[PDB]
Amino acid sequence: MKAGIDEAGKGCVIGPLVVAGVACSDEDRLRKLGVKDSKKLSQGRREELAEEIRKICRTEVLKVSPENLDERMAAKTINEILKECYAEIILRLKPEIAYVDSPDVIPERLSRELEEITGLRVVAEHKADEKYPLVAAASIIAKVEREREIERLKEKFGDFGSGYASDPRTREVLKEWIASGRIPSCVRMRWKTVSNLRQKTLDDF
């Protein structure tokens, strides 16, 4: 069998890094599900689609907590951590060939490093989620798992939006959490790097 590997939450401020792998005996049946154009789907429809994937494919999920990412990032770049995760998933699935969505600009090097780590054939390509149904499926699984961990977090800390610095809801909530001096553990070290989050306005005086 072939397998597809992708991630969700690499660029997050809040929440984990989720890496998922999907291997199917019937690829054509996976195409029949409409994995290719799944980005447009609602949160509800994505959840349903993920359950359909799980029914017909073997799935493997790996989650790296914000705390563990911060720990690992001292000595490793996000992409190196991501590469380690990719290899772990590939080795769990043992496919004949693995298709990976490459975060780095030149994917050919990632293929070479992964094939060395795993000992299996690896194909890393930019935007592989929109070329290989297997990778698109992996993307769906990773997003759904991340979104459920975000939901657990919203239960404790309130609605902080998506968890991405681009989401204005996230910036609002993060701004007040920063101001309160009480920043939850789910918030990555990088929040310190996003400047606007600490810049106060003249209205606060």
Binding site: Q199, K200, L202, D203, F205
Partner: protein, 244 residues
């Protein structure tokens, strides 16, 4: 209605100072002289420009008038005006501004002042530290700091005034004692600011110009620039950044 004559240096000062934060602004022609104040859309920085009448070569007004100006267009035009050149600003009708210098007459449609974002209120800030130094020195300190961080700390106590920046592997400290500063009250204050706003502020000043710093603890900073040999006053107020 409005007929003033100023030097290029004076006009290039007012326009640059304002353009740094806003695109449009209300310009007030008072008995006192020229006045203009604005807040950037972010509500993080404020600019207050004051050019007293005695700075103008000619300053004739019939009444105190307010006009809506496209600062981006005036700034762009003032680049064509020389420092030592004399520029005449004229407002006859209530819709166009005339800018004369050399053999060039520039006419621009005025903005309805009520269409420009509500004029800001000057904040009431209780600030312990009072620092007076050369704007040129300050400019150099910010530039040095800019090589290290996106933000700096303005520190003040009995020892003196400090501008400090920290990187992951290096740091920089600008330090001047009461002896070295022009004026210093030895007030205790510590606030953090964005280097990018400060650089932009400094673009209106140079060596020989006086800078007055009003500093507090985790409060906005008041940067009062006295430019064109005391003929213009440019004040910048910057909201602080919370330290990690």
């Amino acid at each position: 209605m409005i007929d003033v004559i100023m030097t290029g240096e004076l006009l290039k000062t007012v326009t640059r100072a304002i353009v740094a934060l806003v695109s449009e602004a209300r310009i007030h022609f008072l008995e006192k002289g020229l006045h203009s104040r604005a807040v950037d859309p972010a509500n993080v920085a404020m600019v207050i420009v004051d050019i007293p009448k005695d700075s103008f070569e000619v300053y004739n007004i019939d009444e105190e008038k307010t006009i809506g100006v496209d600062m981006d267009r005036i700034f762009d035009i003032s680049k064509s005006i020389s420092t030592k050149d004399l520029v005449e600003l004229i407002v006859e009708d209530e819709s166009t501004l005339k800018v004369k210098f050399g053999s060039v007459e520039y006419k621009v449609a005025l903005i309805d002042p009520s269409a420009i974002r509500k004029e800001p209120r000057i904040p009431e800030l209780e600030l312990p530290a009072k620092i007076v130094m050369d704007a040129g020195e300050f400019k150099k300190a910010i530039a040095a700091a800019d090589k290290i961080s996106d933000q700096v700390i303005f520190r003040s106590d009995k020892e003196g005034f400090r501008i400090e920046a920290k990187g992951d592997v290096d740091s920089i400290v600008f330090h001047m004692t009461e002896t070295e500063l022009i004026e210093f009250n030895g007030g205790e204050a510590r606030s953090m600011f964005s280097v990018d706003y400060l650089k932009e502020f400094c673009k209106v000043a140079g060596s020989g110009d006086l800078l007055t710093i009003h500093l507090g603890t985790n409060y906005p900073v008041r940067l009062v620039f006295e430019l064109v040999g005391g003929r213009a006053k440019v004040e910048y107020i910057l909201a602080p950044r919370i330290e990690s």
